[PDB]
């Protein structure tokens, strides 16, 4: 049974609610982005209207085989009427195709559902600037002040400088980057651009990337692993055993691996600066964990909410424990007292 925080009151709508069977009263199922915890339940046998971005609809048709007649892609930044209700999709600054949804209820209430997002001051000049929001359904993934991490730009600068130094010292070094979902593509694209290489990967991952509307993508990626010196592997293989095994397969072309694991936050963030990050090393293999986040830090979240000044907040992450729920509620009250709304 579908939980309340996935239902939009005063409508026939649900958000990211495909794992509950037929939801009573639901006339349109929205999907914020193509991550498995959110799409769980969708397949080629789904027969209700799915509303989403163009990029999410490309993934639904090619990866999950949802039939075309049930996919309803909407442009961004554009007022649309869905089953008699005005909606707008906004860029969420998460993975490719990820959106936030503004719903303009028939009674005058305005609701923002963030999906998954990484808040940014640029959102203060979207279509959100133009009217009041009553209710906020908020991605609270990192809603605690211990969760700090650098800008995406600082993390990419570290990765490119690290990779270019290593491969210039040793032209026989291979770079490997871990992946298990869409998102974080800048990591491996930026590294391959500084090295003058295409990124090599499995046929399954190439297919996924070909759905993402990235400009000039045919110039940047390939299934020909022999022609590439930046390889993508599943995240599970980014360990000394898995990398040893991969290096064997490369036919003595390479004699060293430099590997990256883009994580979200890890507790090494509470002590170390990005500049000071060091790898784990075993022989001719080195592994860097880099804190590349596609979710808001605590400070970015707080700034967004203090600007938006919603009347009510409904968390959508960390909702399963009383201690999490009480922590989040205390921060919301702090923010409201400090700002004066
Ligand atoms: Ni996500």
From Swiss-Prot:
User: What does the entry say induces or represses the expression of this protein?
Assistant: During mitosis. The mRNA encoding this protein contains an internal ribosome entry site (IRES) in its 5'-UTR. This 5'-UTR generally suppresses translation while specifically promoting expression during mitosis, when cap-dependent translation may be impaired.
Query: Which cellular component terms (GO) are annotated to the entry?
Result: fibrillar center; nucleoplasm
UniProt entry tagged with the keyword RNA-binding: no
Q: Which domain of life is it from?
A: Eukaryota
Supply one GO molecular-function term: zinc ion binding
User: What are the subcellular locations of this protein?
Assistant: Nucleus
Impact of mutating residue 295 to A?
Impaired nuclear focus formation, reduced interaction with PIAS and increased sensitivity to cisplatin
**Keywords assigned by UniProt, alphabetized:** Cell cycle, Cell division, DNA damage, DNA repair, Hydrolase, Isopeptide bond, Metal-binding, Mitosis, Nucleus, Phosphoprotein, Ubl conjugation, Zinc, Zinc-finger
- Tissue/organ expression: Expressed in brain, heart, kidney, liver, pancreas, placenta and skeletal muscle.
Q: Which GO terms describe its biological process?
A: cell division; double-strand break repair via nonhomologous end joining; interstrand cross-link repair
Q: Could you describe the subunit structure of this protein?
A: Binds constitutively to TP53BP1. Binds CDC27, which is itself a component of the anaphase promoting complex (APC). Binds PIAS1.
What does the function comment of this entry state? Answer: May be required for DNA interstrand cross-link repair. Also required for checkpoint mediated cell cycle arrest in early prophase in response to mitotic spindle poisons. Possesses beta-lactamase activity, catalyzing the hydrolysis of penicillin G and nitrocefin. Exhibits no activity towards other beta-lactam antibiotic classes including cephalosporins (cefotaxime) and carbapenems (imipenem).
Which family is it part of? Belongs to the DNA repair metallo-beta-lactamase (DRMBL) family.
According to UniProt, the name of this protein is DNA cross-link repair 1A protein
What taxonomic ancestry is recorded? Eukaryota, Metazoa, Chordata, Craniata, Vertebrata
Q: Write the gene name.
A: DCLRE1A
Q: Which residues of the full protein are shown?
A: 700 to 1040 of 1040
């Amino acid at each position: 049974t579908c939980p309340f925080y996935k239902k939009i009151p005063g409508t026939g709508f649900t958000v990211d609610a495909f794992q509950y069977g037929v939801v009573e009263g639901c006339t349109a199922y929205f999907l914020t982005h193509f991550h498995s915890d959110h799409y769980a339940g969708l397949s080629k046998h789904f027969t209700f209207p799915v509303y989403c971005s163009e990029i999410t609809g490309n993934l639904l048709k090619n990866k999950l085989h949802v039939q075309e007649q049930y996919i309803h892609p909407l442009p961004l930044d554009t007022e649309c009427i869905v089953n008699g209700v005005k909606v707008v999709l906004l860029d969420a600054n998460h993975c490719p195709g990820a959106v936030m949804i503004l719903f303009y209820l028939p009674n005058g209430t305005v609701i923002l559902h963030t999906g998954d997002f990484r808040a940014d001051p640029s959102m203060e000049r979207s279509l959100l600037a133009d009217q009041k929001v009553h209710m906020l359904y908020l991605d609270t993934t990192y809603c605690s002040p211990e969760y700090t991490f650098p800008s995406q730009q600082e993390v990419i600068r570290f990765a490119i400088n690290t990779a270019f130094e290593a491969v210039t010292l040793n032209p026989h070094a291979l770079v490997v980057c871990g992946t298990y979902s869409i998102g974080k593509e800048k990591v491996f694209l930026a590294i391959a651009d500084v090295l003058g290489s295409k990124v090599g990967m499995s046929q399954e991952k190439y297919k996924t990337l070909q759905c993402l509307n990235i400009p000039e993508i045919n110039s940047l990626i390939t299934t020909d692993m022999c022609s590439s010196l930046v390889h993508l592997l599943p995240m599970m293989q980014i360990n000394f055993k898995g990398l040893q095994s991969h290096l064997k397969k490369c036919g003595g072309k390479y004699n060293q691996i430099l590997a990256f694991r883009p994580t979200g936050w890890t507790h090494s963030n509470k002590f170390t600066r990005i500049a000071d990050v060091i790898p784990q090393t075993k022989g001719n293999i080195s592994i860097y964990g880099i804190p590349y986040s596609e979710h808001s830090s605590y400070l970015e979240m707080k700034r967004f909410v203090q600007w938006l000044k919603p009347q009510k907040i409904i968390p959508t992450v960390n909702v399963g424990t009383w201690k999490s729920r009480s922590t989040m509620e205390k921060y919301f009250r702090e923010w409201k007292l400090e700002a004066g709304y």
